[model samples]
Target: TTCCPSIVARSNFNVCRLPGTPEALCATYTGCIIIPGATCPGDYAN
Candidate 1:
């Protein structure tokens, strides 16, 4: 599976940028798939 760990992690801090938003929701918007045995797809990297 492909994921974006950084996006998943960074999404946690989006409360300030997007208060009341769910991490999973924000992560999805930024293209993150949080799953075990998944590797980050560098295209979403900052």
Candidate 2:
């Protein structure tokens, strides 16, 4: 089988990375490597 990690949202910034938020949240989660963003699928930059 393939190893598939979980996908969470960065509630802190709503970044589509991780935040399962504050516990409910964004820097990074699981294997989500989000640098800094203002939107999701919105952009991979500032």
Candidate 3:
């Protein structure tokens, strides 16, 4: 998933996965400024 720089500001951004999935498998990345809340929804399936 992609986030618009204009939309994301001081709000916190997170990458949440569907229940029943392994936590270790749920990789998350955080950023700031224009592209702060950007993440891949799932594995390669996303």
Candidate 2 per-residue lDDT, tens place, 10-46, comes to 2324453243444212333333334244343423322
Off by over 4 Å in 1: 1-17, 33-46
Candidates' lDDT values, in order?
0.53, 0.32, 0.31
Tell me how far the alpha carbon of residue 27 in candidate 1 is from the true structure, in angstroms, after superposition: 0.7
Error of 1 at 45 (Å): 6.0
Best by TM-score: 1
TM-score of each predicted structure versus truth: 0.32, 0.19, 0.20
Can you write out model 1's per-residue Cα lDDT over 3-44, one digit (the tens) per residue?
A: 445645555445423766665676666555555555555763
List pairs with backbone clashes in candidate 2.
19-25, 21-24, 21-25, 22-25
Q: Which parts of model 3 have CA positions greater than 4 angstroms off?
A: 1-16, 28-46
RMSD of each: 5.4, 10.5, 11.8
Ranking by lDDT: 1, 2, 3
- Pick the lDDT winner: 1
Worst 10-residue lDDT window, candidate 1: 8-17
lDDT of 1: 0.53
C-alpha lDDT of residue 40 in model 3: 31
